[PDB]
Scaffold this active site. Structure first.
Site, PDB file in Angstrom:
ATOM      1  N   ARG A 145      -2.555   2.833 -13.048  1.00  0.00           N
ATOM      2  CA  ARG A 145      -1.293   3.263 -12.461  1.00  0.00           C
ATOM      3  C   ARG A 145      -0.620   1.894 -12.322  1.00  0.00           C
ATOM      4  O   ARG A 145      -1.191   0.988 -11.705  1.00  0.00           O
ATOM      5  CB  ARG A 145      -1.511   3.896 -11.084  1.00  0.00           C
ATOM      6  CG  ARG A 145      -0.485   4.966 -10.697  1.00  0.00           C
ATOM      7  CD  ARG A 145       0.946   4.474 -10.860  1.00  0.00           C
ATOM      8  NE  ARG A 145       1.367   3.563  -9.795  1.00  0.00           N
ATOM      9  CZ  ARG A 145       1.844   3.960  -8.618  1.00  0.00           C
ATOM     10  NH1 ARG A 145       1.974   5.253  -8.356  1.00  0.00           N
ATOM     11  NH2 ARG A 145       2.201   3.066  -7.709  1.00  0.00           N
TER      12      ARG A 145
ATOM     13  N   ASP B  51       2.346  -0.653 -10.985  1.00  0.00           N
ATOM     14  CA  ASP B  51       3.425  -0.888 -10.027  1.00  0.00           C
ATOM     15  C   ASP B  51       4.519  -1.796 -10.593  1.00  0.00           C
ATOM     16  O   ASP B  51       4.232  -2.748 -11.320  1.00  0.00           O
ATOM     17  CB  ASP B  51       2.864  -1.500  -8.736  1.00  0.00           C
ATOM     18  CG  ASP B  51       2.821  -0.501  -7.591  1.00  0.00           C
ATOM     19  OD1 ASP B  51       3.879  -0.246  -6.973  1.00  0.00           O
ATOM     20  OD2 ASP B  51       1.739   0.046  -7.319  1.00  0.00           O
TER      21      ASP B  51
ATOM     22  N   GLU C  32       5.181   3.451 -12.689  1.00  0.00           N
ATOM     23  CA  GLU C  32       5.983   3.850 -11.543  1.00  0.00           C
ATOM     24  C   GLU C  32       7.370   3.263 -11.784  1.00  0.00           C
ATOM     25  O   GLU C  32       7.570   2.051 -11.696  1.00  0.00           O
ATOM     26  CB  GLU C  32       5.370   3.320 -10.243  1.00  0.00           C
ATOM     27  CG  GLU C  32       6.152   3.721  -8.997  1.00  0.00           C
ATOM     28  CD  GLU C  32       5.356   3.522  -7.718  1.00  0.00           C
ATOM     29  OE1 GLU C  32       4.613   4.454  -7.326  1.00  0.00           O
ATOM     30  OE2 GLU C  32       5.462   2.425  -7.122  1.00  0.00           O
TER      31      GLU C  32
ATOM     32  N   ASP D 245       4.171   5.897   0.843  1.00  0.00           N
ATOM     33  CA  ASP D 245       5.460   5.285   1.160  1.00  0.00           C
ATOM     34  C   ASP D 245       6.507   6.284   1.625  1.00  0.00           C
ATOM     35  O   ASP D 245       7.700   5.977   1.611  1.00  0.00           O
ATOM     36  CB  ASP D 245       6.017   4.539  -0.050  1.00  0.00           C
ATOM     37  CG  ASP D 245       5.196   3.325  -0.415  1.00  0.00           C
ATOM     38  OD1 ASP D 245       4.863   2.534   0.498  1.00  0.00           O
ATOM     39  OD2 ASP D 245       4.897   3.153  -1.619  1.00  0.00           O
TER      40      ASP D 245
ATOM     41  N   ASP E 170       5.630   5.732   6.241  1.00  0.00           N
ATOM     42  CA  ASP E 170       4.832   4.555   6.543  1.00  0.00           C
ATOM     43  C   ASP E 170       5.305   3.913   7.845  1.00  0.00           C
ATOM     44  O   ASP E 170       6.503   3.705   8.046  1.00  0.00           O
ATOM     45  CB  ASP E 170       4.949   3.561   5.386  1.00  0.00           C
ATOM     46  CG  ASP E 170       4.493   2.172   5.760  1.00  0.00           C
ATOM     47  OD1 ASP E 170       3.340   2.019   6.198  1.00  0.00           O
ATOM     48  OD2 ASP E 170       5.299   1.227   5.618  1.00  0.00           O
TER      49      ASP E 170
ATOM     50  N   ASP F 235     -18.949   2.106   5.470  1.00  0.00           N
ATOM     51  CA  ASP F 235     -19.645   0.866   5.771  1.00  0.00           C
ATOM     52  C   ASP F 235     -18.962   0.099   6.899  1.00  0.00           C
ATOM     53  O   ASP F 235     -18.040  -0.682   6.664  1.00  0.00           O
ATOM     54  CB  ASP F 235     -19.700   0.007   4.509  1.00  0.00           C
ATOM     55  CG  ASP F 235     -20.482  -1.277   4.701  1.00  0.00           C
ATOM     56  OD1 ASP F 235     -21.007  -1.500   5.810  1.00  0.00           O
ATOM     57  OD2 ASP F 235     -20.566  -2.057   3.732  1.00  0.00           O
TER      58      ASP F 235
ATOM     59  N   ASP G 265     -13.214   2.395   3.325  1.00  0.00           N
ATOM     60  CA  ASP G 265     -13.788   1.620   2.235  1.00  0.00           C
ATOM     61  C   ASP G 265     -14.333   2.446   1.068  1.00  0.00           C
ATOM     62  O   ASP G 265     -14.302   3.675   1.106  1.00  0.00           O
ATOM     63  CB  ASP G 265     -14.894   0.719   2.785  1.00  0.00           C
ATOM     64  CG  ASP G 265     -15.891   1.471   3.620  1.00  0.00           C
ATOM     65  OD1 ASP G 265     -16.267   2.589   3.219  1.00  0.00           O
ATOM     66  OD2 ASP G 265     -16.300   0.936   4.673  1.00  0.00           O
TER      67      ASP G 265
ATOM     68  N   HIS H 223       3.776  -9.122 -10.422  1.00  0.00           N
ATOM     69  CA  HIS H 223       3.695 -10.297  -9.570  1.00  0.00           C
ATOM     70  C   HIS H 223       2.288 -10.434  -9.009  1.00  0.00           C
ATOM     71  O   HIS H 223       1.520  -9.470  -8.967  1.00  0.00           O
ATOM     72  CB  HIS H 223       4.706 -10.175  -8.424  1.00  0.00           C
ATOM     73  CG  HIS H 223       4.633  -8.869  -7.692  1.00  0.00           C
ATOM     74  ND1 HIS H 223       3.756  -8.641  -6.654  1.00  0.00           N
ATOM     75  CD2 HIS H 223       5.305  -7.707  -7.876  1.00  0.00           C
ATOM     76  CE1 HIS H 223       3.889  -7.397  -6.230  1.00  0.00           C
ATOM     77  NE2 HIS H 223       4.823  -6.808  -6.956  1.00  0.00           N
TER      78      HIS H 223
ATOM     79  N   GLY I 292     -10.922   0.535   8.872  1.00  0.00           N
ATOM     80  CA  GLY I 292     -12.176   0.313   8.175  1.00  0.00           C
ATOM     81  C   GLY I 292     -12.504   1.152   6.960  1.00  0.00           C
ATOM     82  O   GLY I 292     -13.643   1.127   6.484  1.00  0.00           O
TER      83      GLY I 292
HETATM   84 CA   LIG Z   1     -15.574  -0.352   6.471  1.00  0.00          CA
END
Ligand SMILES: [Ca+2]
Ligand SMILES: [Ca+2]
EC number: 3.2.1.135
Lengths: 585, 585
Positions: free
Chosen positions: B323, B325, B354, B421, B465, B145, B171, B244, B169
């Site tokens: 999952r 974190d 994790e 990562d 990364d 999209d 999605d 958090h 972009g």
């Molecule tokens: Ca998009």
């Protein structure tokens, strides 16, 4: 050094917080392999190049085969990663971490204690940290009301030798009338065996969890006892049997009547229907084939809620804690929720379990506060009573047990000498009062909560059940008042010496030859050294005493002042003499 | 033998049930120190006269320093006491029990597993026991999209080199459009990084837990994705950041606006007001000084309940798991209650944490089903990619990790090669596809759940990364279809061979010189042996094969039929070749 014998884990009894920012860590290694243990640590998110904090792990103790080291990590961030640096007899520098062992720190990796949550700091009631518990077997303590005595009640005499089905008339009113005696003794809590309605003599097969058994009293009387005890500085702990109920339990009677159509069929473990018959049981019970004791399905939410309502009801009466039988056969979720419920209603309510094997799984801080210290009893019996082990073995047994659980649990374990299911300790000592007294002196000065079995304080003796359930001796002439005063004096001392109730424990001397054992209790700057001459012989001993801990001590039992000379303290003890040396701090 | 190096505990990963009447027990000892390990046991209430049952503890494996023995105890009563009978190389024997070690059985004492509750039997989702997970980083998977693209989106090209603040972009609509691709590949679940509304590019600082980030899609689109994936046999796992929140979280903004008057001030960890500063901040955050990530006080009942409602909301949308974190910084009670809630809504919902260190505290069965197997990745990196460790070390690392937790956890650990990562595995292998393929072959046949990072299957490469975040290569001519078909074939094989998903693992051969490692997966009578020639040269090896396990095998990858001669199997493998031999059972 034997790397395969070195142990540590970042949880349980080897890594646990004592506060929101302080983590206690312990390490085990083959005796003699590690001469120095240091901890290098930092916040888990700290930069690699950052200087690591240092914490020296002093040797907290040694048992038969291992040395134990203990350190305290100050973690303001509440997050910590750490690695151990071990030095052996040859100066070898070995790093120990989650990855393993290496001569290089980076290759050892680090253990991690992800986060310290305030709700996870093991917390026990403050009053329980300095308590002296008194176990009362109601049927044999004091008969305050003869109107509730069951048929066949025998005479209450000293020469009375109880039978399995004897009755003497002990009741709750009797306990109330004798509170001045208990207050004088100095006990701070009363632990009662089951007193809930039951058709048996032992009452471990509960018929009604919400009623006092008629032969002991009624609710109005229990309340009076709770209030009168409290105004005397005495708390009340009730024994609850949640593992199983009695066959008279309303829910079980309903299943026995309706069976398949019983709304409570899932409150128990039933194999087939009919649910039972004469001499035969098709449902799970306590132990093996005990029809009067059907096991409760505490995993069933309805059962759990019912028992929680039971707890609610009795706590509303003002009780101060619970002692749980066969606790290890009830699920952990039940115990975690039980603690949450009990502590929410009264954070000062104590929870004690009865487990005859390693209870670490229940002593992390989310379930029980403590359990019965059966290891303490075994060690004291073999060392003081039967003489089966010497001072070094005694030392090793105590140390090994001490390292089983986190310090918050160890500090409040119930240290009993005997119980309603064992022979009297004086009897274990073969009637030797000197041996009996030395064990009591140790009991009153050692780490944990002293538990006195009714009558032991006045010299009562007896073989195991039922001869250990003899009528309490109330005739002062028949009582061993000398022993009574001995107990009183030790109790007063324990309450005045902070180190005896809140101090740590460290072995001071252990000589298998002289059979002499000494330890030191420490709190802040206060040091209290206990010296035990467990031998029928006047002996002299030279103890090490660095000037740092002091150079003068006072034997709190005799008033004798002793002085150290060049880091040594010479002491002379008479047969089975015990010394309680206060450093004046 | 060296008694100090022998270990066992009646809990955790060393004693745990696999059924209501079966207890798995494991014991470790210095490698080669113990030749035979037998378990003598019986119901905890058995008479001291009854004969004890016998269980032979076979050697389940050995790592760098230890040997691990494993036995299964049949406990119809659900209660068991047991003692170990250990025999050394030179025939010397000794009993090992809770009391300790002794030549006399009675003196060794006995370990006890008090009771086995069905609710405490570690249980994980059946589908997850044979799943292949695909990790999707939404921003870079597929842009279905264009209309919801973030400002400044860059062109989608293969030569594109992602920056920390780049946008392509990607999605949810793209994922839906590419489901045919994922179904062809054969994946059974998709794991998404955070997709909840957040102002950042990474989305680890959640602004709205109840909304899909506008750049990825919306609720209707997410529902469609869930339904379209399910009809293709693909489950949906969402990443939850409950440790958090982001600074845009409504509760935190209320605090920034009202300060000490905010009704949510206790939902966080603040030291004073107002809450902010330059390079400075007066509230606890993820890591160190991360203003956009204020830590949530999950211990607060309101916070816990709010987060639980969040979970309820998404599970209501049909997801199949979570999952978690930074799960190790959220308290244990939260996770136990989280599991109860999640499993009550969907027993098949999976919970993965994790944790970058020993996660045994979360893998007992009352919290997480599994965690990310970083150890697996580290071992695969050093053996297949960098060549820092040889076949024997590889074997030891795998074995040690395997023995870390109960089998129910180990069987479902997520075995990743890389992630959003880290550098891509192909790059770790310096672009060598042969090494890369051998690692995938191992991944697809080893114990645990295979996890594919998007694009790895079509030969994508890149540094860590953000270079590991390149836009997915969709132009077929630009994809490595050879690799794709290899992945597809391994995946089909894993589904057809029960031993590859529900089998145990045992080391078969390890030659540090030839750098060749082989292992066997076993379930019932089926045996599947994997042989990895992790060297750039054709080599020949002789593997041991007792006639009991078979004498004929089929290489499921080539169809080659191999025969064993006199209990031996001669194999000649090409450079970096891997063989998967099925015993035909
Ligand atoms: Ca998009
Ligand atoms: Ca009476």
């Amino acid at each position: 050094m034997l790397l395969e014998a070195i142990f540590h884990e970042a949880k349980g009894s080897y890594a646990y917080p004592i506060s929101e920012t302080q983590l206690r860590v312990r390490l085990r290694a083959k005796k003699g392999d590690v001469v120095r243990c240091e901890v290098l640590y930092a916040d888990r998110y700290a930069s690699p190049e950052e200087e690591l904090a240092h914490a020296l792990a002093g040797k907290a103790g040694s048992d038969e085969r291992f040395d134990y080291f203990e350190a305290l990590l100050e973690c303001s961030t509440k997050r910590v990663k750490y690695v151990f640096l071990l030095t052996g007899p040859q100066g070898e520098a070995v790093y120990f971490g989650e990855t393993g062992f290496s001569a290089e720190r980076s290759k050892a990796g680090v253990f991690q204690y992800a986060y310290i949550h305030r709700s996870e700091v093991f917390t026990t009631p403050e009053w329980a940290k300095e308590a002296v518990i008194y176990q009362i077997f109601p049927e044999r303590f004091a008969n305050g009301d003869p109107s509730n005595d069951p048929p066949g009640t025998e005479q209450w005499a000293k020469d009375a030798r109880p039978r399995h089905d004897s009755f003497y008339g002990g009741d709750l009113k009797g306990v109330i009338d004798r509170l001045p005696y208990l207050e004088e003794l100095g006990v701070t809590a009363l632990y009662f065996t089951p007193i809930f309605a039951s058709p048996s003599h032992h009452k471990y097969d509960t018929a009604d969890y919400l009623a006092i058994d008629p032969q002991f009293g009624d609710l109005p009387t229990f309340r009076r006892l709770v209030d009168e005890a409290h105004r005397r500085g005495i708390k009340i702990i009730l024994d609850a049997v949640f593992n199983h109920a009695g066959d008279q339990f309303f829910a079980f009677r309903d299943v026995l009547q309706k069976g398949e159509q019983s709304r409570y069929k899932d409150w128990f473990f039933i194999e087939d229907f009919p649910v039972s018959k004469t001499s035969r049981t098709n449902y799970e019970t306590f132990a093996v084939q005990v029809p009067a004791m059907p096991k409760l399905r505490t995993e069933n939410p309805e059962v759990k809620e019912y028992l929680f309502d039971v707890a609610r009801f009795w706590m509303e009466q003002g009780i101060d804690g619970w002692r749980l039988d066969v606790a290890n056969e009830v699920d952990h979720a039940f115990w975690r929720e039980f603690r949450r419920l009990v502590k929410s209603l009264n954070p000062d309510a104590l929870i004690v379990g009865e487990i005859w094997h390693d209870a670490s799984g229940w002593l992390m801080g989310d379930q029980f506060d403590s359990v019965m210290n059966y290891l303490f009893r075994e060690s004291v019996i073999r060392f003081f009573a039967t003489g089966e082990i010497h001072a070094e073995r005694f030392d090793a047994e105590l140390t090994r047990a001490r390292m089983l659980y986190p310090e918050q649990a160890a500090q409040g374990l119930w240290n009993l000498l005997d119980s309603h299911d064992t022979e009297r300790f004086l009897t274990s000592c073969g009637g030797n009062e000197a041996k009996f007294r030395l064990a009591v002196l140790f009991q009153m000065t050692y780490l944990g909560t002293p538990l006195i079995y009714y009558g032991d304080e006045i010299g009562m003796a007896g073989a195991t059940d039922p001869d250990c359930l003899r009528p309490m001796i109330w005739e002062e002439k028949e009582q061993n008042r000398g022993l009574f005063e001995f107990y009183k004096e030790l109790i007063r001392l324990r309450h005045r010496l902070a180190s005896l109730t809140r101090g740590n424990v460290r072995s001071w001397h252990a000589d298998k030859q002289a059979n002499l054992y000494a330890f030191v209790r420490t709190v802040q700057d206060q040091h209290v050294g206990v010296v035990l001459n467990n031998r029928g012989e006047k002996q002299t001993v030279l103890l090490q005493v660095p000037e740092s801990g002091g150079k003068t001590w006072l034997d709190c039992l005799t008033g004798e002042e002793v002085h150290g000379k060049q880091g040594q303290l010479k002491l002379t003890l008479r047969p089975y003499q015990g010394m309680i040396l206060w450093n004046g701090r």
